[PDB]
């Protein structure tokens, strides 16, 4: 697992409200981000299998976002 911890902090602190960040917080976030990518990729893949195709495309993510409530926050940026 090797997501860059410095990039993650930059993204967290893009929010002006955020002030200081603990030492372990970005590490933990890296792990969570990984599980998020896995689950979203895999859910999208099943829409790819069902369309019988072999390339995961943007529309496959748009469909996945609409099927799962935990991904409902993404409909503002990946509209179907």
């Amino acid at each position: 697992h090797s997501l860059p911890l410095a990039r993650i902090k930059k993204i967290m602190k893009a929010d002006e409200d955020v002030r200081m960040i603990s030492a372990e917080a970005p590490v933990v976030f890296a792990r969570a981000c990984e599980m998020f990518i896995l689950e979203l990729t895999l859910r999208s893949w099943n829409h790819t299998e069902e369309n019988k195709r072999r390339t995961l495309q943007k529309n496959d993510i748009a469909a996945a976002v609409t099927r799962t409530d935990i991904f409902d926050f993404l409909v503002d940026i990946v509209p179907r």
Binding site: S2, L3, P4, R7, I8, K10, I11, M12, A14, D15, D17, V18, R19, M20, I21, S22, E24, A25, V27, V28, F29, R31, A32, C33, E34, M35, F36, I37, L38, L40, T41, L42, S44, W45, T48, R54, T55, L56, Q57, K58, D60, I61, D69, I70, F73, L74, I77, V78
Partner: protein
């Protein structure tokens, strides 16, 4: 999004693509626009969760977001399945 400034709002597309591939069968392929869309989803995920963690510690008059706030935020926003394995991970840092 080719500027260094623009690129700095996202995790690198190479680190994201490697992870995406781990969840797919070896024969699977991923278009370019799918990798970029995944890039934006991850930054949105980081801002979403941080937004809730930030709110909690502000209500508690604390200035530092830590690992406990983050997992609380993930429970609050519905990511319960990530929370169990992460709790054990974050416990390794405190003990």
């Amino acid at each position: 999004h080719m500027s260094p400034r623009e690129q700095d709002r996202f995790l690198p597309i190479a680190n994201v693509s490697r992870i995406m591939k781990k969840a797919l069968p070896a024969n699977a392929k991923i278009s370019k626009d799918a990798k970029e869309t995944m890039q934006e989803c991850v930054s949105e995920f980081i801002s979403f969760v941080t937004g809730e963690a930030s709110d909690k510690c502000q209500k508690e008059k604390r200035k530092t977001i830590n690992g406990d706030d983050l997992l609380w935020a993930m429970t609050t926003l519905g990511f319960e399945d990530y929370v169990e394995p992460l709790k054990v991970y974050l416990q390794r840092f405190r003990e």
